[PDB]
Nucleic acid binder design. Sequence first.
RNA 1: UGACGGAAGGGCACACCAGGAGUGGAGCCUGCGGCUUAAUUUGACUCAACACGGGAAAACUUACCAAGACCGAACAGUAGAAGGAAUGACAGAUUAAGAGUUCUUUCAUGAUUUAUUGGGUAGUGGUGCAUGGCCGUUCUUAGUUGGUGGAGUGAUUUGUCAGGUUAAUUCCGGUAACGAACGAGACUGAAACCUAUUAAUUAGUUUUCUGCCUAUAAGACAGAAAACUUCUUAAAGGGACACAUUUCAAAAGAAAAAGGAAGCAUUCAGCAAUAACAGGUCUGUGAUGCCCUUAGACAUCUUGGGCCGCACGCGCGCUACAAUGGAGUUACUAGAGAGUACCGAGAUUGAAAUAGUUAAGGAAAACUCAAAAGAACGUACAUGACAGGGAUAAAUGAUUGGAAUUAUUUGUUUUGAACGAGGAAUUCCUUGUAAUAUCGAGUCAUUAACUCGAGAUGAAUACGUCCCUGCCCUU
Lengths: 71, 60, 184, 144, 76, 155, 141, 98, 214, 105, 55, 70, 181
Amino acid sequence: MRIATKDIIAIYKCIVCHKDFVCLHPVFGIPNLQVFMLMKGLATKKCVKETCNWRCLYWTLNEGIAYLRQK
Amino acid sequence: PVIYAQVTEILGRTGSRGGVLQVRCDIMGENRQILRNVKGPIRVGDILTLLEAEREARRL
Amino acid sequence: TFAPKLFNKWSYDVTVSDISLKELLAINSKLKYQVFLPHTAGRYQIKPFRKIQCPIVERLVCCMMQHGKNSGKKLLAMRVVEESFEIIHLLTEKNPIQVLVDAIINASPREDSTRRQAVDVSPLRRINQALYLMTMGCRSAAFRNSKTLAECLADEIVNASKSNTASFAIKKKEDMERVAKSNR
Amino acid sequence: ATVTSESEFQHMLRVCNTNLDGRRKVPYALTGIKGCGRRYAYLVCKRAGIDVNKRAGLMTPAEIEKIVDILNNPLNYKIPVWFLNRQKDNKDGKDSQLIANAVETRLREDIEALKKMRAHRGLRHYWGLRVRGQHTKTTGRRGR
Amino acid sequence: GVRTKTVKRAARNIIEKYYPLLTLDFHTNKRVVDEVAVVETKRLRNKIAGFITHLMRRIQKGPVRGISFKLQEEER
Amino acid sequence: MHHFSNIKDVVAIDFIKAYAEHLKKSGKLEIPEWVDTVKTGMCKELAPLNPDWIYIRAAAIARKVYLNNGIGVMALRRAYGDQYNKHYNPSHRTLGSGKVNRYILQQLEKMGIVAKIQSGRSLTKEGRKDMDKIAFQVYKEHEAKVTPMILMPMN
Amino acid sequence: ALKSVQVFGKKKTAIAVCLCKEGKGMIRVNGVPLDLINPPVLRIKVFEPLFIVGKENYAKLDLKIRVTGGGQVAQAYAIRQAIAKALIAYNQKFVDETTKNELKAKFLEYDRTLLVADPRRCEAKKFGGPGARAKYQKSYR
Amino acid sequence: NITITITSTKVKAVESLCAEVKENGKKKGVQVKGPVRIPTKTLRITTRKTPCGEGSKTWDHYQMRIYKRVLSMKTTPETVKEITSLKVEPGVELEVAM
Amino acid sequence: MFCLTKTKALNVDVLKTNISRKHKFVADGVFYAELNELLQRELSADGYSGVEVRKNGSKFQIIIRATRTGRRIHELTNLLIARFGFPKDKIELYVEKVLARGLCPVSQAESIKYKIAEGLPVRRAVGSVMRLIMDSGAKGCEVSISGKLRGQRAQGMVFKEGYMIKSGNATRQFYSSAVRCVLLRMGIIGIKVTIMLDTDPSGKNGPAARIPDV
Amino acid sequence: GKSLEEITAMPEADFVKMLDARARRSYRRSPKLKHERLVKKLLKIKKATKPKLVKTHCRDKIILPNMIGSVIGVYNGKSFTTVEIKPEMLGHYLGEFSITYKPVT
Amino acid sequence: GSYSIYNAHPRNYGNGSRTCRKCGARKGLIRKYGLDLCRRCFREKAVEIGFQKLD
Amino acid sequence: KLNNAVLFDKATLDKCTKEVPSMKVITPAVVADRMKITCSLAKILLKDLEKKELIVPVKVDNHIWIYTRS
Amino acid sequence: TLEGHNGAVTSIAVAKPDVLVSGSRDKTLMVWPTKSLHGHSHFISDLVLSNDGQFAISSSWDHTLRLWDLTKMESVRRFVGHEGDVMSVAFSNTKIISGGRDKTIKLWNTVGKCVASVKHSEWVSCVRFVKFVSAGWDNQVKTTGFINTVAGKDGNNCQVYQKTSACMSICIFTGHVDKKI
RNA sequence: UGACGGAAGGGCACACCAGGAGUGGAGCCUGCGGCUUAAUUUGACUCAACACGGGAAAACUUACCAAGACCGAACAGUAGAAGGAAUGACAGAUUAAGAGUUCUUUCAUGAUUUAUUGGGUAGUGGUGCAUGGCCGUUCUUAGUUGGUGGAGUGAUUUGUCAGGUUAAUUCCGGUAACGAACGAGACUGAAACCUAUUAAUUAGUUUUCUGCCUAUAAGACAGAAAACUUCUUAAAGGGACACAUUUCAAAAGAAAAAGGAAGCAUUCAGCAAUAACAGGUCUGUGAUGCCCUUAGACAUCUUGGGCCGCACGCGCGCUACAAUGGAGUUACUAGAGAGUACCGAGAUUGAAAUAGUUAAGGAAAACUCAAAAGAACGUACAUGACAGGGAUAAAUGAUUGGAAUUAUUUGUUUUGAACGAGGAAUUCCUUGUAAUAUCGAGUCAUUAACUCGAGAUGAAUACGUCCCUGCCCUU
């Protein structure tokens, strides 16, 4: 998903995100959609785990160290 | 020209849906038992009022 | 010497001719019956044969509180009877309570019919129907009529008292007896 | 409790080309006019000084002239503007002056103005349906 | 106002074991049942104490069928 | 058995009637231009029938100041209200009229009967004196006209 | 100094806390005299305890009743208990028992509710009906 | 003066701390003004049993309970009851007010 | 970029400085019911089997009663901060081992979930679990299983052992139940496990006399 | 009660003062750009001129004198119903002339 | 752009601006005491919160 | 339908002033029945007869009026 | 003879010549009726009068003891500290002894404060002076049925309490179980 | 073995009897069918569908329709590619649009990804005739079972019964059965009480001082002040178990009366077994199987409309048809609720009213939160679709909202229809209950005639019977 690169590094430097796409995030202040597509697109690398509880998504850094350190 | 009849005991309740009580009354003026049907709440000590006395209510 | 009066105007020195109702009518046998007001909150509907302990002037008040939009208004019914009871005294120059007991005796049918056959009517049912018939006659007559309810009730009790057939209670009484008369 | 002369008592009055019963009281007889009701009728009696408990049949012809004048001239008789039944009126003028057989006339020549404009409110008036937006599925079931 | 078998059985056991303690007075029988038995419910204790007095009432006139206490046995 | 200490010993409708014409007699309560064109709020659909409805209302409002120390206009508004049953809905209580009550309260301040606490309205010293003077006149003739029930003959 | 007792009577919800004190014979409810009770027809009902045993028994007692519950009829039934109880309690703390027993016997033989509260209270509402026992109409076809 | 307010959902829990604090007022204390029992708050909720509209219209009744007690002392504000918590059972929230 | 304007803050209602008593304990319950379900979806391989949220005045101490056990504890705590907006200095986590492994239905339900998903027959899987539960101290237990055990047409079997009171308020001081659903290659099987406790949670049921002998 | 030329040649803020309650409140509140951009294009049609019909979804604009001559379509639910503005169709809403249902058959 | 108009409607009033805490549904919301747990989800977690099926 | 008359004429008044004080029970809704006048007038008449001392009030109230012969 | 109780009259004492103070199972103390003293929330099990004839004491089943004075007729002091019911109390007139279902004998003083607690294996039904002798339900009298009084269920052929109706007290006034003292 | 009977025996339930209130008949609010429509989204159809999906929809909700856009196309290979993969955009035109959607023109940003295949993913899409969970129902009544034992080749039977009794296989008792488990009971919350204990503010009372006012002997009001706990609040205990009398049936128990706060298990509820339906819900769920669609989308987004459309039919309800009433004034009297990082709003104030301008305190026994039916007043209204009734429309005044037209809600004046107590039929109810009228809460930007509760006035009618409708047992 087209996420501005000045903010992509903000996520890459655990993370949670409300499933509600209407509203902005309270941490980075960027929309919830951009945070969703980045981590979901990264869980397919098996770098994290995508547990969801009460409409909130919890992502835990794991294999991920190889990708994140290189990035 | 009516006569009263004191109640001695209640024989039972009949009449399909129980709404008629059979009571063996007695007449003070002729000291004779009479079996009459009554419509409504009745007790052992009651005294009725009858416009007839020769009708032996038995319902077969 | 506690001597209550029904409205501080009417006393309870009345005699019931019909001895069948002499015990099921609460007038002056016990001091609890003689009340300055027909408003007592007693629990007369918790055990069988307990309404016989209600003051008879009060039982008349309760039956005068019917047909929906008058539900629960005992205060209206108390006012109506108090106004009516003075009128009955004017019409007869007797005790209004003494008039009322005579009306109850003479307006209560002594024979009815159930599914036919002619059956007798219990002494407690005679009092129940009597208040049920005069109250019906007064209520219907006063409906859409210039006369007030108190005047309508007063005229009903006097007529039904002695023998008059103009009263609605008497008209329905003879009709009820006549049908059962032929049903022996 | 006095005997009233036959001539004084009129069983009907002719005010603003309408007939008003003489038995009903003054404010409850002026309601017979199609322009006046009860709030308006009571105010007019007080503004004219007439007795409010007097019967209509006991009105002198002198007071009727005051009554017919005040109804047809409410603005100059200190009647508040919000009391009027036609305010901000089009076709010039901002007064009710509608107490006559003109109550229907003003109403009927609205719809003809509404219908000619082809406004939806006017169209709903033409078709004879409920105009002010009410569920027509179950109500207004006049046989047709 | 019949009584279940949970009270009647419990009423018989206390009688056959603590017969001397019990008497014909319900109010004293309440406190002996609380002492000689463990019932977590106040209502249940009264129900047993209610029936015990009834059984001791029938004891005085003569023996009972299911009841067998030491005093009855010693006189038998 | 009866005795006089304040206005709680005289019937409110009897007292208000007595205190009504006294305000009219004094002539210190001017009549507004809207006295006849207005009802007492919204629930009503007719102007008050009594021509002097201002004075009876003014006495009644003034009595509520006596019993309740600190009162407000909205307390009078909800007290002098009725039930709104103009349509097919079941009725529900509404407030009275804000202006007519507040205007009288502003008028009663002119004659010094009431005051202005930091949190409402209350009587003054002479206003309390004035009412209690009248409430005794009603009390005096009340006992003469009707005997108390404690002395009512035992019948 | 000024020997007095406290009593109270109850109806559906009305509470009538009294203060039975030595005095001239004055009775006041919330300040107003007992003859200025709002539902004037019920006034004779409230004075009913006074005439039961004679008004003189309350001649030496000044009462101060306060009612803060229920309706206007319930308040007029709590005062009856408040007045009747006050005579009985006072005629025991400061008069011998046989006088209290005699007076309390007169009330009980006439109206037992004069000294014991009515246990009846408003029943709770249950779903599926407008009231406690009534139920909504059932449509079949 | 000081004011200690304890609130919980369990009656036995609040009654335990009030007696315990009062028992702790005998030592290193002056007087123990008993627990002034503020009226209980009940949190009624009446929901519908069925996940859909089918079936007879049957509801269910729920209610929390909030017991509140207030303790008034004199003491010294600097020292008060020191910890004035003393291992509150979970679900109890004590406060201290000036 | 988008023209979005709302912000959904990840805060909690237990850290609000001003809160009514009615709104506090209600918000306290919601937090517990949310945290309890949250780590249930993480400690499934562990079987956390309970959580306590005991506080120490200003610090909140979360206790996990894991039956079978600091990297995760450091990891979980960071998750707790981000979701609920905790300050760092007042949040901590602890792990408690439970010895009554047979008495914790939430841990035993996952045992049946593991065995069923593994491929064991359902009667073999449940039967061995009932044996473990019963002797551990429970008075009785029931395991209710419904789904597509046999074929496409659904079916449901209830395994019962021991004593179990079904009605009365005693089934709220005694019962211990947990509901689980395990996905298969045909549908979902729902596993309900109830364990009846004993006097260790002090309290005796309605009918009991046990008169001492003298 | 004025003349047609007077109404359309006098300030708009003055004209609304003689309208009804709802129309003047909708004017009292802020000028929504969905309406400001419409009138700007509405007066543009007559600039380069029965004018060119301009389709519009705005069935909410209060009719004002500045749009008397223009011809505008209104979206009912599917089609831009054509309505020509006349002096008689003043402050009534713009969407009262686009019925959104076939009445009955 | 390709996303500027996306979610441009201002949803502040709320019939669809409020969601269940877990179920994410917009129907059956219980806002009493700030629960915001919509119906059919509060009943499941009622005992955990502390509400009991009393009367 | 009743057309019970609303105002006072000559013959109506004189017949009213004779037999009304002679009735055992006098209420505005029953002298409206016999004299055949609106009982809004009967209130007017009954107040006038009282002022002339031919009827006495046994119960005068805002709910009902009952008089009788002197 | 004698009338006005609402239960079983349990304790009787005549401290002096025409002042009779009795207690029953209806939480009352009647002075013979002239006056009634209230303040107890359970049965009156025993009552002991002082030597002066104007101070009174009475045991009760509400785990408390109340001291009345027959000059103002109100409980000047209440004795607190007992656990179970109280069966009996004895007066010696500066030391007070009492015991009951607590199975503990307490030595109270006339100001209301006890000083020691001798803790029969079961309830102590009677403690009386002559040195005090305590009667329990243990068939013992230390400090074949029960012992009710000293001066039981065995009968040495009926229970001894302390024709008529069952007599619960004696002092001969003999209060009964049909309010028939 | 179960089911069934217009087969018998015994029991039960407002099932019916004695009755009350009614609904059905009028007007309106609302749901379903039908007709129309582009759409009038949909599930549910006897009890167990039809003010039900907490479903009071202007937009969102929203699943439908007309347009328009858009990737919420992850990961991996290839092309292409910092010498620019591509993305964002002013103004003019196209567009409802201030969506650069698109077209001539350039101006910024840069690997975040365009085109491709393999592929997942998403769906208020289908399928409750594939499932979980929850709910309803058989069923508010008393029923269900396995260990050993006896009988039968077997399905199975006995235990689980003759009789009596109870609200109840609840018990006394007879017994090829003995011993148990669940269901009832026992249990939990509320009401009924405690001048005995603990307590004292944010509850009340009392006392004292100050000031004011009237009485003729009391006190009232305001402002402060300290003890005291009958009321208030709420904890622990207490309190009835039919104990005890009379009578009836050596039992189990039953029916008056007395005491008592309480005596139908004291009442109202909660929990409530085995087995089952192929009852409802995949449109509550990131619970979910299989199928369908998956860049020109059935996902999502924007605007507008519809869910409110009327030739009719049915269901739940509100107001009425008057004088036991309506209209005008005056005095009143509860309980349970609910409230702030803008929520509940006192007091002052503009005015005819809704409402507007300022504005204390309250995260609350502390401040806001307040009753009307009914009562009382008057020489008012007099039986007249009359002032009963307020639908319908009309001129205008405001509120909430981005937006009020198909009137959101509401104020003023005017307009003044049916409806004269309602046919065949049918619904609910046994005591602080029915009925009448009102208050709070849920929903709530705005909107109650709905539902969930709460008090206030307080009836009538039997203490019964299987007749109807149905239950539960026995050949």
